[PDB]
Amino acid sequence: DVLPSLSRLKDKGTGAGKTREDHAATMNQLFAAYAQGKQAKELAVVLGESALSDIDKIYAKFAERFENEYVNQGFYTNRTITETLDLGWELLAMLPRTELKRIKDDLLDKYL
Amino acid sequence: DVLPSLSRLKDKGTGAGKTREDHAATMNQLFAAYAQGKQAKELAVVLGESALSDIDKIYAKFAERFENEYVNQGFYTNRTITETLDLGWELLAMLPRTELKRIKDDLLDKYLP
Amino acid sequence: DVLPSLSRLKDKGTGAGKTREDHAATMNQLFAAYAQGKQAKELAVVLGESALSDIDKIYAKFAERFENEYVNQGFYTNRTITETLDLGWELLAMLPRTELKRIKDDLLDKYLP
Amino acid sequence: MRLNVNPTRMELTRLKKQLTTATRGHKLLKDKQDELMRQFILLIRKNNELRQAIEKETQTAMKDFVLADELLALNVSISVVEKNIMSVKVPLMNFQELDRSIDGFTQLLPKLLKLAEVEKTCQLMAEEIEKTRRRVNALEYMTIPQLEETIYYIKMKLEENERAEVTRLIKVKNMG
Amino acid sequence: TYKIGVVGDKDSVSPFRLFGFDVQHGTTKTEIRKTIDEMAKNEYGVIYITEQCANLVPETIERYKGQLTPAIILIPSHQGTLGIGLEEIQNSVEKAVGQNIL
Amino acid sequence: RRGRPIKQKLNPDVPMITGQRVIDTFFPVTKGGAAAVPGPFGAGKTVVQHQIAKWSDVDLVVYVGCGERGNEMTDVVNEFPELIDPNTGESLMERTVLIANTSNMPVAAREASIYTGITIAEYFRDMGYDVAIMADSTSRWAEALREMSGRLEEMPGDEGYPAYLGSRLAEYYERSGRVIALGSDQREGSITAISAVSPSGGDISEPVTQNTLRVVKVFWGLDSSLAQKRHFPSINWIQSYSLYSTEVGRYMDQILQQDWSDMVTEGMRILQEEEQLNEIVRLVGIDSLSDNDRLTLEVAKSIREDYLQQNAFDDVDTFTSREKQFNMLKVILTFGKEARKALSLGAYFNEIMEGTVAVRERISRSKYIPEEELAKISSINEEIKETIQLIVS
Ligand SMILES: Nc1ncnc2c1ncn2[C@@H]1O[C@H](COP(=O)(O)OP(=O)(O)NP(=O)(O)O)[C@@H](O)[C@H]1O
């Protein structure tokens, strides 16, 4: 569970020269979008299919894919940092550019 | 309160040749309907009868009849097991045949009015 | 908050010779009005303005002046018992005389503004 | 008034989760209640002008006829499609000397049906508002308080037990 | 496809007979409700009813508000209204909002 | 610490008359019975006990102020010599014994004070008398035990009380009761015990209350919510009980030659239905209720305000005789029945309310009607029957 998990020294180990320049920004974004996705899921149950914004339905689907494809890699799958980063972007690509507020446009244009 | 109550020696002491062949089936069935009916009855007290399903409305009326008629007999009332098993059926008949999953078709055909 | 508040021994320290003859009657009345007023506010919040009788609204307004003008005096304002009781009478004038049931006619005649 | 639960560490964790859920559900139920309400206001205004208009006109028709035999011895039924407003199930209703008085009635039918439809929709809309209000209220005034009060009680109890244990352990140790 | 029922005084409601509407003429509390509960049994879509007739039976009427069908709609007589239709809208709005918002 | 021996105990089956409508009607204590009043601070335990000491039809009263306020014992020594029985001109003090060990008095002597009182009560009981002993409050007695338990270095029980708390309590309540005394007369006597329990936070799951409820047959459960609303005695009519109710009912029917037990049952049924209905009114509002349901609330309100609530400090509200209680309850219950019938014929709730403003006001004043003129309560019945019947047009 990413939400209650935490690394206190992640910043010292990430970014340009160590992983890739887009590491931190995507982490912050995936973290939020997953939080939003889970909330959207709840809304679905309480207020029903109809009260959901189309932007909301996407977050729902995002949180579902995020658990099922990103977090669920299997106990014998070794992902390089680059594959992980690429998969995150792939997952973030479900959303509109308008929603990825915690990433500099500089990075949006480079990685989609 | 029948739900938390128990008897551990009921199997070998009931049934064909002891009470009647429908003892355990109806007993189990009644518990199922009562546990569910009791949950439905309490919701209805909180959220209104309208907040209940069509069939859970039936289960709730069942739990009223079960408590008020079946369990509530009075301290000077001696019911034969045959009277008790027969009353059990009259309550179970409140419910649709499809709900009565705990009773085999063989038994339903024979006893259910 | 005068509702959870209570002085158990209060009548040994009030009345003619001590405060004024109107003391206990005004107290019972202001209290009752404030309780009814507060209950009306509680109703407006839960169900809206519309759930209230015109009389409830009066009482609701009573509660509000009571809070803002009687209870709220400032931490540097000294009120003599005479100034306090007289102010009690003024808030009472808000209500129909017909409403002041805890106070007898003799007092109403002498004091009711 | 607190709920009938046993003061265990697991129960505390359960109720605390059940409470965070309850809180969030209450806000979402309030949000809906408010949405339905503003959607209700639009429709209830429609209903009102519509009902004022069709009351005045049906009244004139009826008065004309009366002011004018079993000539009325010699078919129209209606169709009901169903639609959704927010989450509420709502009806869609479609048709399926004295001659002057008879005609006025023919011209009412369309407006009478629209009213039937708008009045029902409002009625159904109003009921669902009450249904949501009751849930909001049952949460705000019963469920959330009980959770909150039971949670505080169990914290306290778990605390007394821990204190009781150290008292007994100190006495045990000193049998020596 | 659902049927239409009309309940009212002979004078005011008889012309509805021309459209194939099941027009009925109850005049006491017993007749109106007895005539409504069957109409609900035969899946009627709408039942129009006079305000004078409606005033006799608020208990039977409020029992169907929550149902999708039948819609029970209050109409005037030739004499007019008692103010019930408009007051029922009045009540329902104050109940929902804390009005009057109209 | 030793109980005075007797020939045998008898069933306590005659009701005591407290003059407190809620007590004598819905939760009666018999002579030789035991009742507890557990409740939060300011709820009204001390007042209920004072009332009983003042009005009950016993021969003698023993009042133990155990670990309570000094002023309260003072209040009794001043007020009681001035409270004069008019039929005989003797004051309450001529039939009272007071034992006082206040909260700042030696703690151990709280235990002493309980035993002194019960022993004295046994002694008069032995002579053939009906005695009532009030313990205010048995919780201070239990605290004394815990403090001594601590010094003794004993192994704690529940909440630090000693293991023998439950039996100490049970021993004391069993010294009460209806008995045939020793001697050739085989005279009979009784001790009726009324104890305050003062639970922390008002939590009755506390060991003192729990152990007490194990041996006493009457529970007068005081509610802080009622007290705040000024509804006194703040006896919670849903949670309270008297296990003497059935027997006292039989006894009352016969002495009154009236269906009293039925009236009581109908009253409790009404109050129980109001609790079911108020659960909804909190949720959705009074508007949702049917006319039948609307009335139940109004009848229940009458039982609560005109009957249940009693001002202990009002000269006439302070005691209500058995006959008067039967009359007040009849009137209240009658109005209910008559309306219920009016609703079923075809009349509506709102027309019944408006048509009966005056008779309802009359009903709400019965509690102040003088004991010498109960007939003014009685005539309310015909007024109810006639005014409702006019409305039915
Ligand atoms: N029966 C009654 N009638 C009228 N007023 C009452 C009654 N009982 C209590 N009160 C009022 O409420 C107060 C509380 O009564 P009191 O006897 O002090 O209760 P208590 O439960 O013994 N308090 P404590 O000893 O602190 O636990 C009294 O001062 C009166 O103001």
Ligand SMILES: [Mg+2]
């Ligand atoms: Mg006290």
